[PDB]
Structure 1
Amino acid sequence: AHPPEVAGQIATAMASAVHPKGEEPVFLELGVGTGRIALPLIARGYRYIALDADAAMLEVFRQKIAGVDRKVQVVQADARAIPLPDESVHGVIVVHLWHLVPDWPKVLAEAIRVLKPGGALLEGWDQAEASPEWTLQERWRAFAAEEGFPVERGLHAKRLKEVEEALRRLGLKPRTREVARWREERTPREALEALSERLYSFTQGLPEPVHARVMERLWAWAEAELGDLDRPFPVEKRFLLRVSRL
């Protein structure tokens, strides 16, 4: 959940990167999820095609855009096979997807196929600086390893680097820029909850009962080492937008 001003800044940078050459611009988002990224653009009158393979996600998304879905097309499909024509959209938005797909080279390939000449691939991602939340996540990973279930570290990053390689090679000249930087409050309770809810990919591989045991231990460790679990600490974040153009 991005603060209003930040959500606005990201949308603005995204709309600024699309040059529809006299035509009304249309964005396609791969992995729209619940529409955190989509809403700010949809709210501004932009034609939008929201794609997601998760039916439960689209259900929530349809609810959120109620009353502002006149120019929105909801699509349930795998990013691997976009049910759209070659050169049909001006911008393809990809936020936190690469590490979730089995074959990104195919997803990227599909994204490039549906983009019109002069169209732009728009990748975005959050980046947070060290804070007690980082401390808790690392502790979570340590405890998981102690249960005998060590977890993989930073697949998205490596994935983001390989896509970048491909883009340059394809001549899309990927330019990355910081489009927002802010600081929010986060309490130990909130970070622990996010962990409990298995919101992060690195927490979703362990069998349910192992995660339960790790959480029990983590909650106790936080009570012992983090003071008032309802006391806020700062978390500095920035949002990066990498634009590749045809």
Structure 2
Amino acid sequence: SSALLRAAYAYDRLRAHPPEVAGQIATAMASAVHPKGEEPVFLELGVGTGRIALPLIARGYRYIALDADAAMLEVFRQKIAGVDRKVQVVQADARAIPLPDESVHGVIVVHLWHLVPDWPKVLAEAIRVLKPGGALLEGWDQAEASPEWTLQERWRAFAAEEGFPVERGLHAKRLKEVEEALRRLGLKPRTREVARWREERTPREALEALSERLYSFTQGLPEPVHARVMERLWAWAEAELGDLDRPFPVEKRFLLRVSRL
């Protein structure tokens, strides 16, 4: 409970985008919405803590924030305190959006497909609620190789050594499957890199992100197995990664794929 809420805030701090980057992304998303004269309303499926939503909410756009997770929405509610007059919070499943047909102008989806086996049901709901001329706005972060990549690969290796090998490349495969559906559905997906930057991260911060299972790929392992892997990984890092508090750069990019009805 308090534990679930802390994990939610932890997720928010780990995935936060630098202010300039948040701004670049929000501008690209707002530019893609074409409301013929109406006040544009955005719907985000899997809004989480509101990492993607706040930048837009802050600029005054009507926003419907949908998520199945109560703890994530509790953080979202606190994050938008004082700037929530045009926000509607919704606790529901993206496979059954409680909104009318043709009721929104843009539907935002960032880091959700890989968590939904029957994602085509979500895509169909997004299309159902989008108004003619509406846009599906998919976004995702990408990272280049760094010591964080080395740590994550070491985690994967240790997991396999414990007898629990983990799946690789689900987000990317899922993303391709969705593009296949978007083409087929006549939504003409257009992808563009909307932000590229380098941020600092220390070996210790990367280890803590793994410890707290803040990455979906670390969530499959039984918790005690992850606990054993983390003890191994902290010791390995202390022996092989030098000053655990020395920052290293991590180059990232954010891609936006816009499809239109």
What TM-score does the superposition give when structure 1 sets the normalisation length?
0.99
Separation in 2, partners of 1:18, 1:6: 19
Structure 1 residue 183: Cα displacement: 0.2
**1:188-218 Cα shifts (integer Å, max 9, x gaps):** 0011010001011110011111000000000
Q: Residue 102 of structure 1 corresponds to which residue in structure 2?
A: 117
Secondary structure in 1 aligned to 2:95?
helix
Say if 2:199 is the partner of 1:164.
Answer: no
Separation in 2, partners of 1:3, 1:178: 16
Structure 1 residue 102: Cα displacement: 2.6
Identity of aligned residues (%): 100
Say if 2:142 is the partner of 1:127.
Answer: yes
Separation in 2, partners of 1:244, 1:132: 35
**1:79-133 Cα shifts (integer Å, max 9, x gaps):** 0000000110000000000011131010001011100000000000000000000
Separation in 1, partners of 2:48, 2:251: 24
Q: Residue 75 of structure 1 corresponds to which residue in structure 2?
A: 90
Moved over 4 A (4+): none
Separation in 1, partners of 2:155, 2:225: 11
Separation in 1, partners of 2:211, 2:170: 21
Equivalences, count = 246
Secondary structure in 2 aligned to 1:220?
helix
Structure 1 residue 164: Cα displacement: 0.3
Separation in 2, partners of 1:142, 1:206: 13
Give the gaps of 5 or more residues in structure 1: none
What TM-score does the superposition give when structure 2 sets the normalisation length?
0.94
Structure 1 residue 57: Cα displacement: 0.9
Separation in 1, partners of 2:236, 2:71: 34
**1:149-171 Cα shifts (integer Å, max 9, x gaps):** 00001211100000000001111
Give the gaps of 5 or more residues in structure 2: 1-15
Secondary structure in 2 aligned to 1:153?
coil
Secondary structure in 2 aligned to 1:79?
coil
Secondary structure in 1 aligned to 2:167?
coil
**1:214-241 Cα shifts (integer Å, max 9, x gaps):** 0000001101110000001110000000
Separation in 2, partners of 1:89, 1:154: 32
Q: Residue 223 of structure 2 corresponds to which residue in structure 1?
A: 208
Separation in 2, partners of 1:50, 1:179: 22
Separation in 1, partners of 2:52, 2:87: 14
Separation in 2, partners of 1:55, 1:220: 35
Separation in 1, partners of 2:169, 2:89: 31
Separation in 1, partners of 2:150, 2:127: 38
Secondary structure in 1 aligned to 2:49?
coil
Secondary structure in 2 aligned to 1:205?
coil
The CA RMSD measured in Å over matched residues stands at 0.5
1:185 to 200, 210, 215: 200
